[PDB]
Design a protein around this ligand. Sequence first.
Ligand SMILES: [Mg+2]
Ligand SMILES: [Mg+2]
Ligand SMILES: [Mg+2]
Ligand SMILES: [Mg+2]
Ligand SMILES: [Mg+2]
Ligand SMILES: [Mg+2]
Ligand SMILES: [Mg+2]
Ligand SMILES: [Mg+2]
Ligand SMILES: [Mg+2]
Ligand SMILES: [Mg+2]
Ligand SMILES: [Mg+2]
Ligand SMILES: [Mg+2]
Ligand SMILES: [Mg+2]
Ligand SMILES: [Mg+2]
Ligand SMILES: [Mg+2]
Ligand SMILES: [Mg+2]
Ligand SMILES: [Mg+2]
Ligand SMILES: [Mg+2]
Ligand SMILES: [Mg+2]
Ligand SMILES: [Mg+2]
Ligand SMILES: [Mg+2]
Ligand SMILES: [Mg+2]
Ligand SMILES: [Mg+2]
Ligand SMILES: [Mg+2]
Ligand SMILES: [Mg+2]
Ligand SMILES: [Mg+2]
Ligand SMILES: [Mg+2]
Ligand SMILES: [Mg+2]
Ligand SMILES: [Mg+2]
Ligand SMILES: [Mg+2]
Ligand SMILES: [Mg+2]
Ligand SMILES: [Mg+2]
Ligand SMILES: [Mg+2]
Ligand SMILES: [Mg+2]
Ligand SMILES: [Mg+2]
Ligand SMILES: [Mg+2]
Ligand SMILES: [Mg+2]
Ligand SMILES: [Mg+2]
Ligand SMILES: [Mg+2]
Ligand SMILES: [Mg+2]
Ligand SMILES: [Mg+2]
Ligand SMILES: [Mg+2]
Ligand SMILES: [Mg+2]
Ligand SMILES: [Mg+2]
Ligand SMILES: [Mg+2]
Ligand SMILES: [Mg+2]
Ligand SMILES: [Mg+2]
Ligand SMILES: [Mg+2]
Ligand SMILES: [Mg+2]
Ligand SMILES: [Mg+2]
Lengths: 96, 64, 75, 50
Amino acid sequence: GFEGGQMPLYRRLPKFGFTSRKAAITAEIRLSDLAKVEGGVVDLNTLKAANIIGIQIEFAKVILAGEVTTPVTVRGLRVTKGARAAIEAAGGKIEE
Amino acid sequence: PKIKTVRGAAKRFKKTGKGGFKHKHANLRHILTKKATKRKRHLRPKAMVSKGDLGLVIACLPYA
Amino acid sequence: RNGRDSEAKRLGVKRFGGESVLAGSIIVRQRGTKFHAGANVGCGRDHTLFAKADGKVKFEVKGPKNRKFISIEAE
Amino acid sequence: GIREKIKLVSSAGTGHFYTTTKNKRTKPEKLELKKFDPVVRQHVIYKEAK
RNA sequence: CCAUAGGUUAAUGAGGCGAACCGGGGGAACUGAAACAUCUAAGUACCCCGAGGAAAAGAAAUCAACCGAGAUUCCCCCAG
RNA sequence: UUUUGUAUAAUGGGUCAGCGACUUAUAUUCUGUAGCAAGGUUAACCGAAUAGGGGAGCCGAAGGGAAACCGAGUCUUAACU
RNA sequence: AGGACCGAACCGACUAAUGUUGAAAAAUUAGCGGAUGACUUGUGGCUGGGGGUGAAAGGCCAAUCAAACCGGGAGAUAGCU
RNA sequence: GUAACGGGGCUAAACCAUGCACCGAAGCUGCGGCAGCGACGCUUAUGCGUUGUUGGGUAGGGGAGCGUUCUGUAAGCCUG
RNA sequence: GUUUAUUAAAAACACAGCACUGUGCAAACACGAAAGUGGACGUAUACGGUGUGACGCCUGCCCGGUGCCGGAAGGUUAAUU
RNA sequence: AAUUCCUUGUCGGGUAAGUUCCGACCUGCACGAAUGGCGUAAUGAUGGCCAGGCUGUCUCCACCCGAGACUCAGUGAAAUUGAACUCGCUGUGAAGAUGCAGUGUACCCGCGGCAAGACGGAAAGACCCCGUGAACCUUUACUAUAGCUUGACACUGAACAU
RNA sequence: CUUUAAUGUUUGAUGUUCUAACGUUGACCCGUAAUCCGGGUUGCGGACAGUGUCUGGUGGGUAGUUUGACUGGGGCGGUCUCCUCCUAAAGAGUAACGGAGGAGCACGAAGGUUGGCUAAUCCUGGUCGGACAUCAGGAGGUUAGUGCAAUGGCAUAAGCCAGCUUGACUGCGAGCGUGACGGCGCGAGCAGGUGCGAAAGCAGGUCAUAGUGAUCCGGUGGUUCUGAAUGGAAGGGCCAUC
Ligand SMILES: [Mg+2]
Ligand SMILES: [Mg+2]
Ligand SMILES: [Mg+2]
Ligand SMILES: [Mg+2]
Ligand SMILES: [Mg+2]
Ligand SMILES: [Mg+2]
Ligand SMILES: [Mg+2]
Ligand SMILES: [Mg+2]
Ligand SMILES: [Mg+2]
Ligand SMILES: [Mg+2]
Ligand SMILES: [Mg+2]
Ligand SMILES: [Mg+2]
Ligand SMILES: [Mg+2]
Ligand SMILES: [Mg+2]
Ligand SMILES: [Mg+2]
Ligand SMILES: [Mg+2]
Ligand SMILES: [Mg+2]
Ligand SMILES: [Mg+2]
Ligand SMILES: [Mg+2]
Ligand SMILES: [Mg+2]
Ligand SMILES: [Mg+2]
Ligand SMILES: [Mg+2]
Ligand SMILES: [Mg+2]
Ligand SMILES: [Mg+2]
Ligand SMILES: [Mg+2]
Ligand SMILES: [Mg+2]
Ligand SMILES: [Mg+2]
Ligand SMILES: [Mg+2]
Ligand SMILES: [Mg+2]
Ligand SMILES: [Mg+2]
Ligand SMILES: [Mg+2]
Ligand SMILES: [Mg+2]
Ligand SMILES: [Mg+2]
Ligand SMILES: [Mg+2]
Ligand SMILES: [Mg+2]
Ligand SMILES: [Mg+2]
Ligand SMILES: [Mg+2]
Ligand SMILES: [Mg+2]
Ligand SMILES: [Mg+2]
Ligand SMILES: [Mg+2]
Ligand SMILES: [Mg+2]
Ligand SMILES: [Mg+2]
Ligand SMILES: [Mg+2]
Ligand SMILES: [Mg+2]
Ligand SMILES: [Mg+2]
Ligand SMILES: [Mg+2]
Ligand SMILES: [Mg+2]
Ligand SMILES: [Mg+2]
Ligand SMILES: [Mg+2]
Ligand SMILES: [Mg+2]
């Protein structure tokens, strides 16, 4: 960072933002995964048991990340607008 | 020895999808009354670290 | 008692007669209207002349005071 | 300098304000001007000139 | 005055040494901050006191999160 | 050796032989390369000891936004051509 | 009688020559000043380092003093050669 | 110390002009040789016979290598 | 008399003398976290500091600044409440 | 003037000749009354100037006695030193040449002398700048702080008037 | 309940008195053949001194440091940022302690728009008309004027005047120009909403280029974005801004 006696960019420029305390317990799940849950039920903790998200996550989504295969019942997870069509376009079930 | 971050660097830059860094404009803090509204409008939105300046901030953020 | 000067403002012509420009591209930075905006060319608050249309720059002298006018014909 | 910064407050509850300057000696009264309140989306009257 | 000091004698022990960890009592500046006084170097070097096969900590007025994990010294993550 | 420049009357070596100056540690990043590959590797720790076990965890497939969140979008703005 | 007088031993150091890889890390040779006094000396003892002691020159503190000597932080820092 | 043609000497061996020769360089050319890259002639883990070119060099950057000392293949292989 | 031992012996430091000023003694000061020693087994005709330097003739003018002595009514004024 | 810049001031005094000295004047660049003023007999290895003495200090050096130099024997060092087949002059060039150029001069090696040169030896210039260097000193620099001082609660309480 | 006295208590102040902590480097006794020391008695003092905690003052006594750079050595003197011209060799840039000047402000209209308007100075004539206040005539043609330095602009005026007013609007942004950088600047057009006009239209500040201050720490005000168990809260965030 030394740029000569001149004020470096990281002092030149201002701070912004705060950390909210949520990134570390919220994970995202892709379609290339979910079939590996070795039990055919997608819950809040099944995915934890399978070592796919992480032990301290409390919220999860699904997003549209391609390839959707075996029918799954996504329970206690949010599903994006797109993802619901892919999950159902291969059966599966969504419930709150 | 794990590396130590220049911690002030980490409070002004966040890394984007391809590998550059986004940042906030200077001058937005005080002494705003004399500045034209247009000038402040184009300074509100975030910017990219320029090519000439990338060669050091990256030195400062090995864990970004 | 001296010892002062001003920074150069990098004025002068940026696009000359016979050059393809987009819209918005600056053609001349000036102090007064040494050059004037002609057909299809616009004038900013510091008399910076800019293109209002895609095309080629054209310097002509028109009217009774022999002023220089810059226009842009689409190509 | 010798010209003070003031704040104009929107006469519609919004918390939008403009900032400008004033010769407080030569111009002692409260400045009053229509400006666009981006919250009520209309040209409302603005007050204050400290 | 009683009394306590004070005195006398036996037996018993303690006295000092030598690396290092430990525990605690004391505690710098150079340096770095391309000046330097906050901060850094460091609770580091040094002082002393003491000590075991180790010491010191140790058994929830500790955490958790409305589900529960349960003394406590240590190895890698968490995580620069 | 140093300089703009040195027979330079600028510096260093009297001669010899031996000694005598870009290393060690961990990170992180580029390259050459190996294995493996939408997955790649485990750390301690166990030990029949470099074998084998151990995926806690870390890198990646998805990032936009301070964050809420939304998600092949998203942030802007009341909405954007 | 006197920090009187001339003046050896004693003490000290104004002049000059030598000596400068000296005989000697200040001395010798020719003169010098003081020599019963605030004298001179033996033997011991006491002051310890931003401290001492000084009839004051920053003088003396073991041939070292604008901060003595040994070992330690220590390969301090060296943007300099 | 000649000491204001580098010297001796020069009335041209000075100067102007027109010519025509001749010396003169690590340049050009000639002959032999090496490397880099470039292509063909052709096939091939090519190499060339070729063949266009190119090869002064601080700092500095790239690339290919020689040898020392120690371990293994090495109870192998040398060696009175 | 004294001095920079080891280039400065002097017009320098000291001296008796003179002045100012602190000091009632468990003094003031000075050494030392403190005990306790000096001062002094002295007691203001005595002790400390500071300036001046025998003897002679003498030491004027300024209190605004500056530094000290005294002042205590009013201004500002900390902890605490 | 131990102060005086101008200044060798001016004037007298001494001398043949006196930027010093002595005397004076006052124009005090820029004396002064205990950071003492003026003057003082005595004392002083103190500073300045002069005079009778004395002279090798000198004019201007002559001659002599000894110690080393010098010759033999015995013993035996030193700093320095890229390498030496280590010359004059002129010019040249990192601008002052034993090494270049031109040119002149010179048989090859000692021992005794001098010291003009080797930008001689010795010392990583003591002047001088520069380093965001260092170390002791200063004060109405900064900032803290010992000592001194102000108080407040505590050690630390009991009565009475107001 | 409105108001006050008494007393008891409580504690606040001012003085006087006491004695028991608290001092005694007053005398005597004892441990005892002891100038220490302790205990004991007694006199003297006494809620004071002295000491610890904190607090205002003092403090080169002693400590740590700072004490700019440039510069035709340094110091002295001057400079340090911006703007205009110039050297600058006819695009941009260009140097020195080269040559001349300026800025650290002003404006609620000295801003937008609609309509509409034209200077400087010679000659002649004219009340008080004086060389030059003012009316008139022609000559004259931006030398005037531009809120101020220079330069380039200016008549369609950017100059001068007015009625109406607020576009000095908030959101944005094709494309560029200039920057090592941070940044700096030009802008047709778009949504919203606006002013003026009959309208086409013109307005996102002042003819333009000076009118300056990054980062931090903190301050307002709106914003449900965050809220360390939860609900709020605090602090953090963003916008506005000092
Ligand atoms: Mg995981
Ligand atoms: Mg803000
Ligand atoms: Mg430092
Ligand atoms: Mg320091
Ligand atoms: Mg234990
Ligand atoms: Mg429970
Ligand atoms: Mg040089
Ligand atoms: Mg070079
Ligand atoms: Mg030589
Ligand atoms: Mg040199
Ligand atoms: Mg040399
Ligand atoms: Mg040498
Ligand atoms: Mg005598
Ligand atoms: Mg005598
Ligand atoms: Mg002497
Ligand atoms: Mg001496
Ligand atoms: Mg003798
Ligand atoms: Mg003698
Ligand atoms: Mg002795
Ligand atoms: Mg020292
Ligand atoms: Mg250290
Ligand atoms: Mg070293
Ligand atoms: Mg001639
Ligand atoms: Mg040839
Ligand atoms: Mg060939
Ligand atoms: Mg080469
Ligand atoms: Mg000595
Ligand atoms: Mg002498
Ligand atoms: Mg006295
Ligand atoms: Mg005196
Ligand atoms: Mg007072
Ligand atoms: Mg005379
Ligand atoms: Mg004479
Ligand atoms: Mg007086
Ligand atoms: Mg005086
Ligand atoms: Mg006197
Ligand atoms: Mg004497
Ligand atoms: Mg011999
Ligand atoms: Mg040469
Ligand atoms: Mg020569
Ligand atoms: Mg000699
Ligand atoms: Mg030399
Ligand atoms: Mg020399
Ligand atoms: Mg040197
Ligand atoms: Mg100091
Ligand atoms: Mg300088
Ligand atoms: Mg130009
Ligand atoms: Mg007239
Ligand atoms: Mg809470
Ligand atoms: Mg807030």
